[PDB]
Amino acid sequence: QKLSKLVEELTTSGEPRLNPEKMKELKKICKSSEEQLSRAYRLLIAQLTQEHAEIRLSAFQIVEELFVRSHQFRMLVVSNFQEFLELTLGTDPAQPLPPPREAAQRLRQATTRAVEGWNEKFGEAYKKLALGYHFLRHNKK
Amino acid sequence: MLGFLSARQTGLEDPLRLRRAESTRRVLGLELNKDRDVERIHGGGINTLDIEPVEGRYMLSGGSDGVIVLYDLENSSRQSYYTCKAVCSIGRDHPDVHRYSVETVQWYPHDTGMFTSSSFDKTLKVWDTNTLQTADVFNFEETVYSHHMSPVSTKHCLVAVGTRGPKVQLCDLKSGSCSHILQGHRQEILAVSWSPRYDYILATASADSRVKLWDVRRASGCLITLDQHNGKKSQAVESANTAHNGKVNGLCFTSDGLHLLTVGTDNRMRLWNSSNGENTLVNYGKVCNNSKKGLKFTVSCGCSSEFVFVPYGSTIAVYTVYSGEQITMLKGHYKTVDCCVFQSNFQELYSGSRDCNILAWVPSL
Secondary structure: OHHHHHHHHHHOOOOOOOOHHHHHHHHHHHHHOOHHHHHHHHHHHHHHOOOOHHHHHHHHHHHHHHHHHHOOOHHHHOOOOHHHHHHHHHHOOOOOOOOOOOOOHHHHHHHHHHHHHHHHHOOOOOOHHHHHHHHHHHOOO | OHHHHHHHHHOOOOHHHHHHHHHHHHHHOEEEOOOEEEOOOOOOOEEEEEEOOOOOOEEEEEEOOOOEEEEEOOOOOOOOOEEEOEEEEEOOOOOOOOOOOEEEEEEOOOOOOEEEEEEOOOEEEEEEOOOOEEEEEEEOOOOEEEEEEOOOOOOOOEEEEEEOOOOEEEEEOOOOEOOOEEOOOOOOEEEEEEOOOOOOEEEEEEOOOOEEEEEOOOOOOOOEEOOOOOOOOOOOOOOOOOOOOOOEEEEEEOOOOOEEEEEEOOOEEEEEEOOOOOEOOOOOOOOOOOOOOOOEOEEOOOOOOOEEEEEEOOEEEEEEOOOOOEEEEEOOOOOOEEEEEEEOOOOEEEEEEOOOOEEEEEEOO
């Protein structure tokens, strides 16, 4: 719906840059209804699973901004988020063989910095962020 | 629950009913408690965990980094949130610390004052818990995959040790004799487990796809060799009578000891009659293990229906033992899970993994 419209308007790689007005509109829409974000993750898995690395970066940034801002993606990334733990363990680490890793190295660095930020941003009881960061630092950063 | 309380209170139902039923309900509700943490001390993956059999208060943990950590599992703080602090630790600076991966660690049954631990440095060290010093060392010619002390034998205090040799070493902690060997396997013994029922029955699982039950008193080889088919494919025993179609890297007797659970690298878990080694044909589906070493898994105790918590990749898969029905998969680890140990007092599970973490699973509500 409108979630998909905003996802298309933002993830488009023809203008691959962070736009604040669209992101604040998405934040306000997600705050208006929690069900906006539960399908948004499904949209983001579309963008993470897409061929273009810029779309993956865009969907990662959208997921991060919804988790840190909307207060509805927080209840997806810091509660009922084993999908998020597995996507963190599969994104930076090697994709499970035979399937190899398809993201770009700049996207790997962006994910590393996002994990380092989220270690302190929301870690009141979610320590698997830090555990995954340590595993990366000792196995496939 | 109010029906259960009333029926206990008025005597319609044995109190046993409420205990077993509520423990089962707690186990089914087993969930990653972020309300409890285990202090991270291992620099490497945790290969083994062991909660003490008496009082269940302290837990040992052996890592691939060679260190041993001794945790306190009791909430000594008044808050509802607490961290299972590390009481002691055989660290990198302890003179007796293992040089390589600690693959198995076991509290001495009948008393908490002693515990034994084996490593890929080809040693089984016996530790005095109070002094935290080795009281004995058994060197083996080959690296140890598993050891186990009988949880039941008041009489003998042998340690069955499985190393890459085809022979099972029995090490008597009572005056020290590590010469006895049980011969009959053809490749590395990856798991050893004494029966909890019979003082002298030992089940040993090896790389040659065989599990054998020995009466260490007996002088005449294995009692029984577990057979998948029970006779449908029958051959003069030189290559047949395999327990699994791969390496058998895990053993576990059920609580009462009347059945044996073996998991092998054929991605199967089988349940065997521990008396005549007959396959009970319980399905269990597909139990993913590809471990190149021993896979330590546990069963529940004191519940209405017995469960088995088996490491399933990065998760812990919970099955019903006697029906195979997969209850659930506990998903909280980031790398493959090596060991899970069951706290039967409170239906709690502790699982260690290659991600250098020990996660507590506590029943919810």
